[PDB]
């Protein structure tokens, strides 16, 4: 399964979570930004690696980073 990391440059704009096609990211409470929220990656087993999450990231060099790793039938997007 791929690896997804969140960095404290998160501004809690939720654009990553609402762009994930496989429900990998979610918004959790935080105290490091104005919005009081930070993205989390608790379901990386469903991560497919499409990187839509970091295409919607407005922070300078990203706050969500997807590191491709071992492959799985879920991560390979295999309907068969």
């Amino acid at each position: 399964s791929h690896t997804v990391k969140i960095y404290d440059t998160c501004i809690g704009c939720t654009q990553c979570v609402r762009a994930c096609p496989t429900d990998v990211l979610e918004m959790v409470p935080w105290d490091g930004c104005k919005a009081g929220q930070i993205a989390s990656a608790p379901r990386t087993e469903d991560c497919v690696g499409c990187k839509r999450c970091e295409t919607a990231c407005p922070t300078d060099f990203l706050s969500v980073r997807v590191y491709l790793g071992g492959e799985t039938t879920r991560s390979l997007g295999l309907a068969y």
Binding site: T3, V4, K5, I6, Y7, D8, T9, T14, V17, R18, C20, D23, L25, E26, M27, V28, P29, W30, G36, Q37, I38, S40, A41, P42, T44, F61, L62, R65
Partner: peptide, 19 residues
Amino acid sequence: FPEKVNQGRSPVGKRDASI
């Protein structure tokens, strides 16, 4: 829904630094 913040969620995969 994951886009709305709910109490009882812990941060997973959070690094306390930038890239």
